[PDB]
Each structure stands twice: as C-alpha cells, then as structure tokens.
C-alpha cells in the first residue's frame, strides 16, 4: 500500500504552512527546493515528502484544506470575517409581534411600533 506515514505528512504540512509563496505543483522543483530548505537524511524520504506536498498543493488549488493554515489563507479569512452589510438586517424594513409580545412590551412600559398578527394553533 501507498499510504504515507505521519513523518511525511507532518513534514509536508509544515513545508506548506511556511513555504506557500514558493513551491508549486511540480514534483521536480518541489524536490529540488525541499533538499534546499530542509535537512533530510535520505533521498527516498525527500521524494515522498515532495510528492505529498505536491498532492496537497493540488488540493489547495481547489478550495482549502482541513489542518492547513498559511498567511495568505489567514488574511483572506479575517478579511471575509470583517464583512458587514450596510443595512444591518435587524434594522427596520417596514415589526411583527404576537399579542403576548405586545403584552410583554406593555408590561415593560415602552414606546415601540408593532405590526401585530394573531398566532393560531
């Protein structure tokens, strides 16, 4: 079986976690920079790591990946996180509330507009 071990997978995850604006979908140059940027004792393990990094970069080119996080991805995430509409959907567009809710408001003693509708069983 061609199942990779956690040494290979962790090494590839780290290489992607801190060398993404770099190595590409090509096993050859990914290998030729893996031996440049990491200390690996054996060519076989180097090539396995390079292959798994190439596979993960192919995965990344189509959507994100669970367990991975690089600076570009983090910046995209926070940028999408600060999104806000300009309308603030809670803001009034016309508010409906049942008779019990109208009674609640009357109990609290508050001035509010209400589009009362009856709640039927």
């Amino acid at each position: 079986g061609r199942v990779r071990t956690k040494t290979v997978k962790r090494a590839s995850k780290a290489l992607i976690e801190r060398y993404y604006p770099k190595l590409t979908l090509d096993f050859q140059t990914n290998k030729r920079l893996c031996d440049e940027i990491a200390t690996i004792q054996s060519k076989r393990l180097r090539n396995k790591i390079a292959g798994y990094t190439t596979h993960l970069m192919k995965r990344i080119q189509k959507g994100p990946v669970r367990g991975i996080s690089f600076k570009l991805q983090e910046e995209e995430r926070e940028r999408k996180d600060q999104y806000v509409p300009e309308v603030s959907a809670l803001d009034l567009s016309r508010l409906n509330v049942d008779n019990q809710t109208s009674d609640l408001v009357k109990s609290l003693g508050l001035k509010l507009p209400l589009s009362v509708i009856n709640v039927s069983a």
Partner: protein, 206 residues
Amino acid sequence: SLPATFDLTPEDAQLLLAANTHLGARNVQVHQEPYVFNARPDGVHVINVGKTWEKLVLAARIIAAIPNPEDVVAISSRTFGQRAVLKFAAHTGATPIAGRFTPGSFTNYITRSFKEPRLVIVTDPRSDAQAIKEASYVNIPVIALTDLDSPSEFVDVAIPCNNRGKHSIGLIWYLLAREVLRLRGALVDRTQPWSIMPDLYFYRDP
C-alpha cells in the same frame, strides 16, 4: 443599586425583538426557569427581555470585576457563536475557545491549551457540557446563555435567550461586549449606540 440609566431602552428592545430573543422553547420547560411571560399559542413560550437585560448587565458587572480580562474565557462549540466569541475576544481580552474544547484545558496543567481562568462564558450548556463539568473541578464560575429548556446545573448567571437562533446569540454577545466596554470606560457615552453593528457577530455559511 443602579442609577436608572441602565434600564431597557426601546432601541435595545427593538434589537432583541427583531432577533426574536424573546421566543423561548416549546412546551418543554425546566422548572429552574421562571423567566417565562404568558406562553403563546403554538406552545411557544415568551421570555421577559427585561429580565434578560438585567441578568445581562449583572454578567457584565461580574466580567468587569475581573482585573485581567484574559482570565475570562468564552466557549462555543456551536457554529452559530464562534464568530461571536471571537469578536468578543477581539473587543475585550476574553481568551476565546471556539470549536473544540480539548478536555483537560482547566485541569492538566501541562497541556498546551491550559487556561487557568477566573470566569468562563458559555453559549449552550448542553453542547458545552465538558467545559462546565471541568469548571466544577477547579473552582470557576460559569455564565451561560440559556434557553428555557437548558440544564441549569453547574450554571451561575443564566441569560434567557433563543439559542436556537442565529441572530439571537450574536446579539446577546454584542450587547454583553457593549456593556462590558461601557463599564470599563472605553465607551464613555452610555447613551451612544456604539458604531459597531450587531450583525458583525453573526454566522455566515460562506
């Protein structure tokens, strides 16, 4: 007591009723919850948003009593509250824990997720039961956003809300952070509406 400026304003009531925080659970009802107001037909129970606001301000005072804000912890294993707790941690100190809790975070002094807080805030005590259970081992209080059918055990201040809802949770977190900042002194104007919108702390499927 309070100077009566803290009472429920019609703006906050508009927000709370637009987010439908006042819509409690169905006929199910934990007898530890007297926060009900005149059950609706359809079997849905309505909540005293006034009591909600009062308990919320109480929780805010408890939080602001903490000297080191990083010693406050916000929990949410639900997806509808992760953005809320993260933005809460952005505006306050409030060391957040969104997603998984990692059992052994308040015990097990060696693990990397080891917090030793003075207060933990929880979005749903049923989905976040590991956290309250581990807080009952190490002398930590627990604030919780409860519905009317939540398990009240090992729960201190309970804010009645609609935790089934997407907007309600984020609104409660938003109001909580606002009151905390006001009591701390960042928001010097109690009457000002705090430019940050409430829909910032809201879940998005994308």
